């Protein structure tokens, strides 16, 4: 992909490529890091008490948010060396623009809507797959069928705002005040964060050109941060909280 | 892909791009609306009576048919803005025959299992997912191991198509006869059409030479319209018939 | 990929492509006749005496031995044609080392996790995938990042190898001392010949240099053998074993 005589000068690719890989190195780091906690504390036991599980074992699916996490800081790796190797490799993740998300934001939303008990949770996933699908096609497209692509993206993601809004607004008051602070805060990520990604995509060097390539990389870093390692903090704390109160204090859901 | 001179005259990429677009497009429309009808109806609840569920919630499996429509058609979309464009664009979805079928195809054949409780659903999945492989390989080798790859594709195909015969007859005899009549549809369906895929290959401008690349468009988009969304709307009445019988009235399956 | 004018004398691609056409051509018929025993036996019903499965159907999981095995055995057909057609192929799994074991490595740890009923599956899996995904950049990847690539797998491997080692040892001692005959030997197959594969990426063209391309697709061939067949073989063995104990018998597990 590179040029053997280095990218262009005035190309969207000419990038202060040290500093994009400083970047995602520090990002895999505490990504990475967080993932480790949040499936040691899962190991410990049931509740902030650390009731030990009856099996022996924490339920599978409670491994998916630390799970995401240690996908991501992984990815966070590659994205690294593509940088500091100069951008352009053959394996670079840096490349394709969202075929990363395409992994890590279906998981997201199981893990989601695992522990919350949201109904319809094969539909949820594939909502989020196409959606991505659609950002990686806008993205490679250079004509202006770039919009008809984007256009799709928003079919699918404008329906799964709406219907995952109603549906945890039903189960956001089954939930005890002290999990509900939690939950709270899971929401504002997921209905603010999420949000940003394509509302981003339109100021980019794409669309009407307000946002560089390179402060697009150092975004998306940050977006990360807080979508995958924060998320999954929140998940973790709310099902410790959740379990206090069902398992180890053995109060029932209002449900 | 395309060259900057566009495709040449007597090239099999020299296609009438405006109505391949256009057939596309009625299609994505169709397959995609058909899909949402199977949604919406699988929701409102058990049997033509629309018995509530119990659990407040269909079954997760039950949403396939719907989902494989939503996802076929929105891949219409995509081939669709690929004709428009010209074709040869980056995100292709017309340039790798049978790519997209990877996706749709197991998925199928995962739905009429669960809803007719198949055994050995794992074997059919991975029976079909390999066969279509073959296919995508087949179509992209331009030496004779083109045979190689679609005979070992048969290979597959043969004893996946007779053992599902043999299973589907002794399932049968185990559902009323109100049901029975869209079983029988289904069954035209899948061993009628299925087989119409392998024989058209061989008359295509790939074997033989008797159908052209855009017949070949043309008469696919016909295929996915019976064995996505009209295959979708049989199962979706034959699991309406079903559930009347044995849930709505009480009765009991054969068996 | 392969130059009009075949590939240059010195070249890693300058290869004897009959005698590996023919190896993979023989892998592909003895990996495959295996999965069809596998699957076949496993029909028959459970234990050595082939009491009735009360339901009539094996479970699901148990079939993923043999599917691991016909799985295998399509991509050595594959890789065949590949290397007859003189390599360099379009639809060539010859061409990305560690690509096709991304498919069927993650199943053979499911498999062995199902059938000893191993805890955290799905960390298992993914532990896993990434791990071969590492290994695919790493062989991509021409620069020094080469071994950056190595190391991140080496990061996800060895904790798996060390936490399945102590969780295997677990459970050793629950099952009945004939069984326990069985478990050894794929214990010494995942702890032999798993680390064989980082092992041979040192001493390869890739790395210091003593192993050509050649002898190193010869070597994966046995490799492939013994970790899918063999260790195919024994997982039924260990199962027909446990179950005539089990089932047959009715005794129970030490546990
Ligand atoms: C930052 C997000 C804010 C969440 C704080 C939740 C909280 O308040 O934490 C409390 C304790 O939670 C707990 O066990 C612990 C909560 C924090 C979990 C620790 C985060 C680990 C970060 C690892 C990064 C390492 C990088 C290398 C919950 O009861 P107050
Ligand atoms: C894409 C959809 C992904 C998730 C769909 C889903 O799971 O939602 C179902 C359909 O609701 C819905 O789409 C209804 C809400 C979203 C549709 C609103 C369309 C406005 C444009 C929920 O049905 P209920 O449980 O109410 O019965
Ligand atoms: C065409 C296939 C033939 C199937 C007809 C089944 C039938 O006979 O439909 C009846 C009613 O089914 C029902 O609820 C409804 C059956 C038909 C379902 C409606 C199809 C929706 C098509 C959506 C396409 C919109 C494009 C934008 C079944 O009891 P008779
Ligand atoms: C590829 C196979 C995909 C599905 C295989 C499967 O699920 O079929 C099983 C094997 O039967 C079979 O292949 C037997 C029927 C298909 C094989 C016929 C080979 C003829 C060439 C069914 O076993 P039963 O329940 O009778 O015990
Ligand atoms: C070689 C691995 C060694 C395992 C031998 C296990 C053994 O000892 O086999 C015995 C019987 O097992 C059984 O039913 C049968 C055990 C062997 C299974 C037969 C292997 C089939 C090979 C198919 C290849 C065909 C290629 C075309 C187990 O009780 P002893
Ligand atoms: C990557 C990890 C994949 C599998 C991880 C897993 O499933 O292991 C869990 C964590 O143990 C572990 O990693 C502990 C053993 C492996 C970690 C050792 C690190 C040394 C370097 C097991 O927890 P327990 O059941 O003891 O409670
Ligand atoms: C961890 C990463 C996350 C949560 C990413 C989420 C990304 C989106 C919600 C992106 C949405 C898009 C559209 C709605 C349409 C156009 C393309 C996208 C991918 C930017
Ligand atoms: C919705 C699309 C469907 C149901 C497609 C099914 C396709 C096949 C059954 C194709 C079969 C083939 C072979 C048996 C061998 C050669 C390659 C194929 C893919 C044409
Ligand atoms: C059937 C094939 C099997 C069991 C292959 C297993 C392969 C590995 C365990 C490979 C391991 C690697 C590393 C630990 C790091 C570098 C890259 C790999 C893929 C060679
Ligand atoms: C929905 C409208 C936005 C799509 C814009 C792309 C137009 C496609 C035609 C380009 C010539
Ligand atoms: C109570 C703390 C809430 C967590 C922080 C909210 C998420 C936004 C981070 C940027
Ligand atoms: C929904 C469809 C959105 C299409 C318009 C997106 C913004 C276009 C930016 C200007 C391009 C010059
Ligand atoms: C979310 C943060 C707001 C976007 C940052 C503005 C882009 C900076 C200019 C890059 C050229
Ligand atoms: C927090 C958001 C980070 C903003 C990134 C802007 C970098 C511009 C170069
Ligand atoms: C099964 C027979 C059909 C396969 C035909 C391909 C032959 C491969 C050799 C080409 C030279
Ligand atoms: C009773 C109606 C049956 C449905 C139609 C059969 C499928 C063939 C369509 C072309
Ligand atoms: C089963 C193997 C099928 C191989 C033959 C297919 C038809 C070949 C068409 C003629 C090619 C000139
Ligand atoms: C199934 C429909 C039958 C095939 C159609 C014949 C192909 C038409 C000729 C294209 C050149
Ligand atoms: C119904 C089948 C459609 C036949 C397509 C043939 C088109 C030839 C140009
Ligand atoms: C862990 C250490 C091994 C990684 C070696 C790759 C070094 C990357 C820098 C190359 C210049
Ligand atoms: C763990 C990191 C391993 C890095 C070193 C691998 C061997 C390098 C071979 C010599 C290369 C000339
Ligand atoms: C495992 C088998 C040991 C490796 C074989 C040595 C490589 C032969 C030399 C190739 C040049
Ligand atoms: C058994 C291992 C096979 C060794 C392969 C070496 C081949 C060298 C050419």
Not at 87 to 104: A, C, E, K, M, R
Not at 142 to 171: D, I, N, Q
Request: hydrophobic share 45%; glycine share 8%.
């Amino acid at each position: 992909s590179r040029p053997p005589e280095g990218w262009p000068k005035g190309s969207i690719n000419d990038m202060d490529y040290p500093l994009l890989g400083s970047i995602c190195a520090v990002c895999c780091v505490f990504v990475a890091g967080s993932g480790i906690w949040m499936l040691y504390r899962l190991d410990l036991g049931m509740g902030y008490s650390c009731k030990p599980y009856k099996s022996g074992r924490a339920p599978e699916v409670n491994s998916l948010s630390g799970i995401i996490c240690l996908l991501c800081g992984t990815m966070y790796a590659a994205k690294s060396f593509d940088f500091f190797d100069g951008g352009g490799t053959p394996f670079s993740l840096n490349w394709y623009w969202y075929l990363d998300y395409v992994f890590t934001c279906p998981l997201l939303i199981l893990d989601f809507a695992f522990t919350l008990d949201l109904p319809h949770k094969i539909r949820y996933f594939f909502a989020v797959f196409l959606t991505l699908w659609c950002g990686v096609a806008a993205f490679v497209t250079p004509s202006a069928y770039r919009f008809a692509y984007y256009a799709l993206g928003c079919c699918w993601f404008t329906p799964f705002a709406l219907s995952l809004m109603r549906h945890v607004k039903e189960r956001y008051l089954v939930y005890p005040p002290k999990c509900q602070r939690w939950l709270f805060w899971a929401c504002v990520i997921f209905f603010g964060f999420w949000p940003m990604f394509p509302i981003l995509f339109i100021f980019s060097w794409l669309g009407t050109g307000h946002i560089s390539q390179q402060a697009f990389y150092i975004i998306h870093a940050f977006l990360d941060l807080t979508c995958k390692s924060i998320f999954g903090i929140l998940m973790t704390v709310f099902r410790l909280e959740l379990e206090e109160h069902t398992e180890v204090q053995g109060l029932p859901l209002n449900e």
